[PDB]
């Protein structure tokens, strides 16, 4: 229900051990607008797989 002792801050490191984030490995570069974007996602400009998939 509730603890009987104060937990050690060293345990607090051990509980937060697996709690770390994870960044992106590599960004998919466009081949026409020539810019990095998310793999299997469109660019910020509206490009995907080279072509202009959406006029913004």
């Amino acid at each position: 229900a509730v603890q009987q002792n104060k937990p050690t801050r060293s345990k607090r490191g051990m509980r937060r051990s697996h709690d770390a984030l994870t960044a992106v490995t590599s960004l998919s570069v466009d081949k026409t607008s020539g810019e990095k974007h998310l793999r299997h996602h469109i660019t910020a400009d509206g490009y995907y797989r080279g072509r202009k998939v959406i006029a913004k």
Partner: protein
């Protein structure tokens, strides 16, 4: 478990899943491309990719499921008059999915759904 099943609850009851794809498919036919979330595109691949099966071929009696879960007849007048003859030879796959970043206020994964022959 949901072995061999098919259907996402979408955290909504079935009467609202009914009534939401009314307007969502009801406006995609209008503007030919819209911004929605990706599970409301991926469950909508069980919905809108069959809601273009709605858009196959004109009779008189085929004006009616496109009244039924749509409450609309103007969009009926767009489908079999213009879009039926548009997609006259495509045997499936009338759409395309564009995962377009995340929604601001809740980090919801958005996407663009659209038609294949938009231009």
């Amino acid at each position: 478990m949901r072995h061999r099943k098919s259907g996402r609850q979408l955290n909504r009851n079935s009467s609202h899943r009914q009534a939401m794809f009314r307007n969502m498919a009801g406006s995609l036919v209008r503007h030919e491309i819209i911004k929605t979330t990706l599970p409301k595109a991926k469950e909508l691949r069980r919905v809108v990719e069959p809601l273009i099966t709605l858009a196959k071929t004109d009779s008189v009696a085929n004006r009616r499921l496109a009244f039924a879960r749509t409450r609309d007849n103007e969009i009926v007048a767009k489908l079999f008059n213009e879009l039926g003859p548009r997609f006259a030879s495509r045997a499936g796959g009338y759409t395309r999915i564009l995962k377009c970043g995340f929604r601001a206020g809740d980090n919801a994964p958005m996407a663009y759904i659209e038609l294949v022959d938009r231009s």
